[PDB]
Amino acid sequence: AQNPNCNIMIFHPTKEEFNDFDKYIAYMESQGAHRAGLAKIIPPKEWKARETYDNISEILIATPLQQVASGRAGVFTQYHKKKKAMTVGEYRHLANSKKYQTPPHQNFEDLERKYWKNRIYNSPIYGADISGSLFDENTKQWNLGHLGTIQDLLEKECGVVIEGVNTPYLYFGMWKTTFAWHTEDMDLYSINYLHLGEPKTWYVVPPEHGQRLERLARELFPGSSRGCGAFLRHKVALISPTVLKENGIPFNRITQEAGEFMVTFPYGYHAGFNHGFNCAEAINFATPRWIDYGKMASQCSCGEARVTFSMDAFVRILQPERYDLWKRG
Ligand SMILES: CN1C(=O)C(=O)c2ccccc21
Ligand SMILES: O=C(O)CNC(=O)C(=O)O
Ligand code: NI
Ligand SMILES: [Zn+2]
């Protein structure tokens, strides 16, 4: 079996290889990339997402989120406090202010140490989940607004015809902004392009070991576990690499820089943080291999987790028993 240690693999496609998206995902998996839960793809040198980022400041962040932590440095939750709307220009200025800016640091490792030491004592503001795209419409390769849809994948594979759409989201981050431990909706893939700015550090558990992370989470957040059979679906729990190591949880880490893609694979738990002001674009997608993961994706049982319009149809078709129980609940 390829990649038995489940290492994060890094790919350097040629421009010819960058034409067929589906084919290249399949190629990465033939090399065992999915076993890590996460892969990095460096686009060919000839490729560009768009001409410049000089004109993005008037994008609105309608609901910036202040990420307030509760708990200890290595085991905490975060909740999102809604803030008043601001433009990306205003947000960038805030990110760079003395209160919120990245501290002096020696390297990525030094900054990582500072993040896990000091994260809980600050409340950075995140512009997350903003529907839209920064890819030029003339960018024909790996344009996250031009991917085949999950609905069409299900139709091609299963003859299933359903409602729903599939569009990208923008993320404007700053130092210490955090994404909690999670897999994707329906344990889909995701693909994430870092358009500009400072890096994003990722942590990931191999899909074959996801239930080890779940078991630790149940131990570390016992009240939450009693309240919901899949509370990581709430996307508010953080566990540090030190605590993962202490508990023998298999994981890897990698830092994504501007101009690089990351792909998360079905049931690959991931978490991470931003180094400073940046902008990323991400979207979920499917392949034929995903369908078996979608049908057995664990779901929130308490109603706290958000379910998009499109996810409704996925649950209805792939998980009819869960759907029925949920709608009667
Ligand atoms: C949020 N949520 C629930 O609360 C539930 O029972 C369920 C089942 C499938 C997908 C989502 C669900
Ligand atoms: O970038 C973020 O804040 C979170 N991104 C993801 O979880 C993803 O792309 O799957
Ligand atoms: Ni994700
Ligand atoms: Zn729940």
Swiss-Prot record:
Q: Which Cys pairs are S-S linked?
A: none
Listed under GO biological process in this entry are: cellular response to ionizing radiation; chromatin remodeling; double-strand break repair via homologous recombination; inflammatory response; positive regulation of chromatin binding; positive regulation of double-strand break repair via nonhomologous end joining; regulation of gene expression; regulation of protein phosphorylation
Q: How is it modified after translation?
A: Ubiquitinated via 'Lys-63'-linked ubiquitin chains. Deubiquitinated by USP14 with the help of TRIM14 leading to stabilization.
The alphabetical list of record keywords is:
ADP-ribosylation, Chromatin regulator, Dioxygenase, Iron, Metal-binding, Nucleus, Oxidoreductase, Transcription, Transcription regulation, Ubl conjugation, Zinc
Q: Which GO cellular component terms are attached?
A: blood microparticle; chromatin; nucleoplasm; nucleus; pericentric heterochromatin; site of double-strand break
Q: What is its main location?
A: nucleus
Q: Where is the JmjC domain?
A: 136-302
| Keyword Transmembrane included in the entry's annotation | no
User: What terms describe the molecular function in GO for this protein?
Assistant: chromatin DNA binding; damaged DNA binding; histone demethylase activity; histone H3K9 demethylase activity; histone H3K9me2/H3K9me3 demethylase activity; metal ion binding
Q: What class of enzyme is it?
A: oxidoreductase
Q: Which cell locations does it reside in? A: Nucleus
Instruction: Look up the record and name the cofactor or cofactors this protein needs.
Output: Fe(2+)
* Annotated positions of the PolyADP-ribosyl glutamic acid modification: 16-17
Which residues does Fe cation bind? 182, 184, 270
Q: How is the cofactor bound?
A: Binds 1 Fe(2+) ion per subunit.
Answer yes or no on keyword Acetylation.
no
Span of domain JmjN: 8-50
Query: Where does the chain bind Zn(2+)?
Result: 228, 234, 300, 302
Annotated residues that bind 2-oxoglutarate are located at 126, 192, 200, 235
| Entry's EC annotation | 1.14.11.66
Q: Which reaction does it catalyse?
A: N(6),N(6),N(6)-trimethyl-L-lysyl(9)-[histone H3] + 2 2-oxoglutarate + 2 O2 = N(6)-methyl-L-lysyl(9)-[histone H3] + 2 formaldehyde + 2 succinate + 2 CO2
Protein role: Histone demethylase that specifically demethylates 'Lys-9' of histone H3, thereby playing a central role in histone code. Does not demethylate histone H3 'Lys-4', H3 'Lys-27', H3 'Lys-36' nor H4 'Lys-20'. Demethylates both di- and trimethylated H3 'Lys-9' residue, while it has no activity on monomethylated residues. Demethylation of Lys residue generates formaldehyde and succinate.
Task: Give the record's family classification.
Answer: Belongs to the JHDM3 histone demethylase family.
Name of the protein this chain belongs to: Lysine-specific demethylase 4D
Species of the source:
Homo sapiens (Human)
Gene behind this protein: KDM4D
Please state which portion of the whole protein this structure contains, as first and last residue out of the total length. 11 to 339 of 523
